[PDB]
Write an enzyme that holds these catalytic residues in place. Sequence first.
Site, PDB file in Angstrom:
ATOM      1  CB  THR G   1       4.689  -7.126   5.635  1.00  0.00           C
ATOM      2  OG1 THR G   1       4.406  -5.790   6.071  1.00  0.00           O
ATOM      3  CG2 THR G   1       5.065  -7.975   6.835  1.00  0.00           C
ATOM      4  CD  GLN G   2       6.539 -10.237   1.412  1.00  0.00           C
ATOM      5  OE1 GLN G   2       6.342 -11.311   1.981  1.00  0.00           O
ATOM      6  NE2 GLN G   2       5.567  -9.550   0.824  1.00  0.00           N
ATOM      7  CG  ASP G  59       3.415  -4.370   8.380  1.00  0.00           C
ATOM      8  OD1 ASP G  59       4.065  -3.417   7.902  1.00  0.00           O
ATOM      9  OD2 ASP G  59       3.492  -5.536   7.936  1.00  0.00           O
ATOM     10  CG  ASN G 104       2.974  -5.892   0.713  1.00  0.00           C
ATOM     11  OD1 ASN G 104       2.100  -5.205   1.242  1.00  0.00           O
ATOM     12  ND2 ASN G 104       4.269  -5.666   0.896  1.00  0.00           N
ATOM     13  N   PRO G 105       1.352  -9.331   2.479  1.00  0.00           N
ATOM     14  CG  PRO G 105       0.795 -11.544   2.743  1.00  0.00           C
ATOM     15  CD  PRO G 105       1.913 -10.672   2.283  1.00  0.00           C
TER      16      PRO G 105
END
Lengths: 204, 220, 239, 248, 199, 239, 206, 232, 240
Positions: G1-2, G59, G104-105
Amino acid sequence: SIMSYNGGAVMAMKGKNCVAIAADRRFGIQAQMVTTDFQKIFPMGDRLYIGLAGLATDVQTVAQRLKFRLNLYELKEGRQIKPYTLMSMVANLLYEKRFGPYYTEPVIAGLDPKTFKPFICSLDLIGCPMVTDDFVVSGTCAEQMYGMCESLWEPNMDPDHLFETISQAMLNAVDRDAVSGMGVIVHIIEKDKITTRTLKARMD
Amino acid sequence: TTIAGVVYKDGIVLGADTRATEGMVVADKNCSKIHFISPNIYCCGAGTAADTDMTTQLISSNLELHSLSTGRLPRVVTANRMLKQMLFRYQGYIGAALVLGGVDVTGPHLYSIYPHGSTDKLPYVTMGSGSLAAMAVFEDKFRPDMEEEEAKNLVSEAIAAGIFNDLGSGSNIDLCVISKNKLDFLRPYTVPNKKGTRLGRYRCEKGTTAVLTEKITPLE
Amino acid sequence: SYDRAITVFSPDGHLFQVEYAQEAVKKGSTAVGVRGRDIVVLGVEKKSVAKLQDERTVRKICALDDNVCMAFAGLTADARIVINRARVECQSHRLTVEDPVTVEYITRYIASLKQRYTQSNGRRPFGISALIVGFDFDGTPRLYQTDPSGTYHAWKANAIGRGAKSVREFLEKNYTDEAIETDDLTIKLVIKALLEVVQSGGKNIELAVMRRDQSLKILNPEEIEKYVVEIEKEKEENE
Amino acid sequence: RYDSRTTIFSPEGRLYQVEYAMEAIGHAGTCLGILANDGVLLAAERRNIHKLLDEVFFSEKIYKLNEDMACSVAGITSDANVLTNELRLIAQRYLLQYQEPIPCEQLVTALCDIKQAYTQFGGKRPFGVSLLYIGWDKHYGFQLYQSDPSGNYGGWKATCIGNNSAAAVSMLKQDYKEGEMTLKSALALAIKVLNKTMDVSKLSAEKVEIATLTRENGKTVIRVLKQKEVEQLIKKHEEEEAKAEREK
Amino acid sequence: MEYLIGIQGPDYVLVASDRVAASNIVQMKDDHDKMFKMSEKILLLCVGEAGDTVQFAEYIQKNVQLYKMRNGYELSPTAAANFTRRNLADCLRSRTPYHVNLLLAGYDEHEGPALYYMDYLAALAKAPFAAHGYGAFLTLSILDRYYTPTISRERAVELLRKCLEELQKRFILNLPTFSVRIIDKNGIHDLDNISFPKQ
Amino acid sequence: SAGFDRHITIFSPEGRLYQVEYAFKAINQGGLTSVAVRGKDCAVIVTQKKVPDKLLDSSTVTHLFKITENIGCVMTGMTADSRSQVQRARYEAANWKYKYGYEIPVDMLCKRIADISQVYTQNAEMRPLGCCMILIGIDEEQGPQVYKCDPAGYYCGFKATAAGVKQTESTSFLEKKVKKKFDWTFEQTVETAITCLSTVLSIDFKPSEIEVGVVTVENPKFRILTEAEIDAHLVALAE
Amino acid sequence: TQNPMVTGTSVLGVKFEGGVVIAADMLGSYGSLARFRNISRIMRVNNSTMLGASGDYADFQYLKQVLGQMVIDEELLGDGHSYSPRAIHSWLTRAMYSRRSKMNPLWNTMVIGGYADGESFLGYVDMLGVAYEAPSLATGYGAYLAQPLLREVLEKQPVLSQTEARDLVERCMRVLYYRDARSYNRFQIATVTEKGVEIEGPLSTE
Amino acid sequence: ERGYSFSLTTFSPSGKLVQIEYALAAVAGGAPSVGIKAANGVVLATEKKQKSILYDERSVHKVEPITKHIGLVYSGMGPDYRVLVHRARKLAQQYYLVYQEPIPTAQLVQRVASVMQEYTQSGGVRPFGVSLLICGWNEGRPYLFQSDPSGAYFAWKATAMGKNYVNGKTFLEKRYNEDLELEDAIHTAILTLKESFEGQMTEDNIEVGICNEAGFRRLTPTEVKDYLAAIA
Amino acid sequence: TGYDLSASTFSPDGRVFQVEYAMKAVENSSTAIGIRCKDGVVFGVEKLVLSKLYEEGSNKRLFNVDRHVGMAVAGLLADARSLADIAREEASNFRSNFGYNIPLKHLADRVAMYVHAYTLYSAVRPFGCSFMLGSYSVNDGAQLYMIDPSGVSYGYWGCAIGKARQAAKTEIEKLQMKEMTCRDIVKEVAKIIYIVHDEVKDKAFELELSWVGELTNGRHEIVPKDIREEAEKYAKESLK
């Protein structure tokens, strides 16, 4: 500007049962010529020679590394490496590093071991076979040699005629480029003899 | 580089130019762009020449092992699917524009694969630097179920149009006709241009060049 | 039935494979090493090489570093590998720490390699006992013996290989401070000790002599001949 | 018993597997090499001489390793091939890193180290291949080296391994003149030794292979004698034997 | 940058370099030595990116010394040159490049004196004379117009003095002392350095 | 002789692998029989459906597994290993489709199966899968195809075949039948297969004791005949 | 998740005596466009805890599968123990903090609230891992708009009722609709009390 | 010495790799195969008998191509032959890719021998129980090599492997002349198969392949029928 | 003897002995019977309390593979618990990668493949516990699969694993599972289990029941204690 870091050029020519090789003799960093005894063509066999153009380090890695694998091929096969096999053998050597490519442009010129068929070839930095029946130009001053050969080359050229055309074709090109020059060695290969000549080029 | 292919009534017809250029200077005028894959399949390499050469041999050699295992002629769909996967595995890092063409038990087929790793079945497709020129010729003269003889002219005009309308192709014309009972490789099908004669003898006689030192060694 | 695995303990707590490996050291040419105030000597017996073979490739005394030398017994195949690894270790230790490898450190590394090879199956113990001697202490002579098991020891004068018991018995009853007070007397002691084990003429004893801040000096047969002549003269004087 | 695996030590301290391999090296065909003041040579016996066998390589027992080395073979075929391939790889790797020919003893030591590693680590059988080495280097010149299955090499002036190695070696010791042998004399002695080292009489040219190392104008040419010169040498030895029996 | 200048004599090679180590403002040490003893008849001069030079030479030295002991015969100066360069080619493309310019010179009994020029890209070259660092453009000409194919020992040192004297004339900063060594049949020897009052 | 039959990678004195033969024999442990008959335009296979318990679910006991809509298999022998091999065959067919597009021919499918079995037999890591894998399926340009390919790793082309306890008898019956060249029709093929099974087993072949699967050129999809179709074929066979 | 693609509006929740209530919109706005308008941003984890989050619904949807299996495993053992609202919160804090450490949060600002053993729990773990306990929490913009309001009601009276909680969020999301460019007039309300967790909706405004 | 007839990584007291000899025996206990090298080409023949008329003789081919100018016939365990042929094809194509020249018979045979030897060095891997016989036409000279499980390769002019190989070898050296042609070589190979062949030699029971300058090709049942009728 | 020391060594007659030994080991344990209602699947296992110090629920043999799948292991309890963990892992992975409850048939097939993979290697031994899988779903009805150490697993209308498998089957075949509901079938299961009990060789036991079907909204949960006693009351009514 990678190809310009060390400059230089190597020339291979073909004629009537003869193969002609010409190469620069200057070695130096991007600006200052460090040595004038550089060997940019290496014999891969009795009647096969390979000249490398590009970064001197990569050229010398390629020269030694190829002779390493070719020696294994020569011993395993028991026969002199055919020029076509050497060409593709070089091509794989370059292509195995498409992502870390070697900044060296090789040109191979020689006679067929069996039929004595003159063969010259060129390989891109990424290993592309380049078979031509009239000439092959490799180095940093490629334009000068390529342009002149279109005007000087002639089919069915005699063993002596081959040298003069290749010599003037190269000596003319070298004087028109600064990074490469300061002496040159031109090799003439014939089935019975090999003639080694270094033309009087402009030391400038 | 202009590669084109049109699926005619009885099979496929392929063609390509012979100009490979390093930067802005053409390497030569005879370089072959029609790549041998199988006795019933062929490709034209568009883009990075060495990458096009290396990828095809890997695809052709890999296919040959498959063909030797089956004892049947390889089918084109097996040509692209293995070929397509290899390109994607590199996520387009290899700049090779290739066009798949050939015939199999299911009839003639023509597949075009992008350098990024995408392909589609188009009865007439072309690729390369002058890919636009070949596509233009197709849309004005092509017709379904075109005859074998006229098919070669269509591609020859298509390739010829790219030769004289683009800076990156020409110097020779090569076609690779594919049919159930024919594999006609045309090297060269036609010569679009011939170098002008040399009006001036350039007097390359003996003694015109001087040598610092000599070394002659006999061999054999 | 407890002598077929290295990592199997006998009911009396014996690692029998290592003991068997020492037997390999028991089958080699005798090596005698005695250290003096300003000299360290490594005695060796030559095996009267075949009439038609060159003795240049039968080197049994080799120097790990510029000032540390070792004489081994046992099988040559393992001794060569141990010597090569010791050389590489000395050149790595110099690289990491500029100080030259001490004799103690090289002996410790040799023992560590031997122990690592005698710690698990699928790895035969090194059947060579190495006498590592060197002035690497920067002003202090040291001599060590690395058993095939893996334990090393500091020895004023020790013997390895065939006849080790007899040579050790001779060295114990003759090695006194008056004996090694000078380099010549130390060399004479080495020759005398090796004479009882190797009854033969010249070229049957190879002596490696190293002096403080110097290099190895493999004594030529003449010098050993001179020392044996001197020892014979001394025996004549005693009679 | 204590020969289940190589790693096992006998109570007396003997690698029984290594000794078994070094004994089995005797099954291999006879090969020998005599060092001469101007060069060194190798001699081998072709055990397989069937009429239906086509000779395609002519170097079944004598292989070229480098431009200045060659090594004969004796032992298992697969092990011999692996060892020769590793020898070529080692020599070419040394050439690539140092850009000069391996000084012979380096290649011998590398192969001996490989063999020792095999005889040490468990799960690997000792290489039952004992191969003679020949070559010239700038440091010591012509040399002949013997390699055993145990990795214990050694310089030698003339040695024979394989069938009846003991007799050949003994009678080479009896009639080898140190420092007074020329390549022609070396070949004569090699043929004389091979004549009685093998039971086959008349020493058929097709049944014997001879290779010679010479130092010509700084090239180190390795020459495998053609059948014509081998037959000439055999005829010369026959005439010499007749002359010797003339005294009878 | 430091200075690596060498002259190939008829039967010897004289290689010289400075003794000034400075960290971006000032000469930290004045007796620092930058020419390494490869073996008894071969020497190494490594300049270039800091940190890399001190160790890469020590690694090349350990492996040149390691070869001299595991074999009993010291590596030939041409072999050493190929090896020192060979290592750089392998690591140049690796993730830990060695940005070091090096000069190699030594004596081989069989062939004679040699002096090889090593560029940070690991490109080897045999030259009668060479100069390293920035000052190369300043004295490389001095050798070019002054060198002779048979420079004697006494005239060889004078040339470097002229080479060194010119350096003191143009070079912006100070190089009070330089190292001078001679490689010959009997080994490598040390000569006196140079100094110049400015009062 | 008998001491070499405890490891699969050890050759017997006469040049035999005993473990592979042992797995072949284990094939019969299930006590079942399966037969395949290749007609002119159809391929039919019939296998026994033994349910020796009233509480079993007859729908979950079927041994005819569909590897693919176009390719079929009948596992004879050990149940668990047969199901494992069927799953592996499904994976192989799926991977072939994904990597080459066109459906994997039956011959290739269980040629891959047999290569897996052979690689199992060469490297001594896993017991060979003791279950004969009989494959059927219409192949374009080659008509109906039935391939039996077994633990040891042998696959061959079969006009008719059978694997199980009663294999020799069934194959002899087929040989007696396959020789009188006649119209090999769908009905004729099913009738011949059922007749061969009935004579070999000497059973009246109640409809709930047999399970049949047929692939035809007209309908090139594996179809498992229901009870009604099997009963109709049996009644036609009787008269 | 960028680079978030489908995001979410604010998430609001105010705790009262006897339970906690949360609400969220149902507008999945890819960029500025209302890509989806029937998605649920508040689903229950167990009988005594519920959660809802903003950010990438994909997500968050991944989180739904993780918690469901992670939560479902809780009752499979059948030992009686169930993840307490703090228990889920603690897992969440390490869950995202571990993910953020590898660049990759989860770009999904969660809020978890529940009722356990007579005490209410209202935690908020941001897209990066920050987490705290507050009587009233609003994600994203709600912190700017609804969050200030909730302090005023809590500051003078920290005790609230279910009806007082119900309209309070309505007066909270209502102002969200007026002064927000990403809100939507269809939201669910999550009530957790001794009787359990119940989700109802949507609801509109004038 | 029964104690050492088990492991391939241990040396017998006499120095015999017992398992390799046992694998060679298993090879010699297989189906017959005979090949003759003629000055014009090479011939490879194997007897393909199925245990019953119920086997499709065309489904499995003992003679298979490795490349356009290499062949393969075997005598022993067929399942091992399948992996051997797969490895041979992979090796030939790797050589072609690296060198863009069809792999010479000698090099392909050497690499196949290396592959075979790869399995005879570690416990737990059974030596390849099949001895391959390789055809070839490289550089205008017919080739015939035999690769064994021991890894050794030779240059057989003409030999027969498998069951009744002694009789085949005896037949050879009698009907073999070094100056034959492809047709005479085919006839001699068919006769050699006949002298070790039980039952009628049908077109579907004997599989042969000519491997001349034109390349390796498996004779279809029609050509085999014509040749057998000519000989018969 | 000789061929039965490893699971990778085929017996001369063609039988992997270690698998049969594992089957005997499972045969050496207590009975566990699964009976399929017309609208559900019922599990019942006689759980012997080896000592009076146990906590009336310790080492229970009824395991919840997933929400809808019940497992009734009988045999070596450690292997049964490991198999339950593997089954839960497979169910979780199936749900995550496919999004819907893993069908009992597919879960049983995958777990059976896992079990069979442990009878093919020499370094591992066959599982010593036989387990039956049960589940209910309106989409796919009620399914009851039993997988033994051999790896075989086909569906069952009703099965018993343990000491008195044959005795349980004798009185289970006398039950009409085709039509009955999961309400009286529980009482039938209790009675059948109580019939198959030595009571002179086994000191005492703690009957534990389980079911999954329409009456439980499709989920598998421990039978409620309120109705579990009713099953116990019926079993006591039955004299045996």
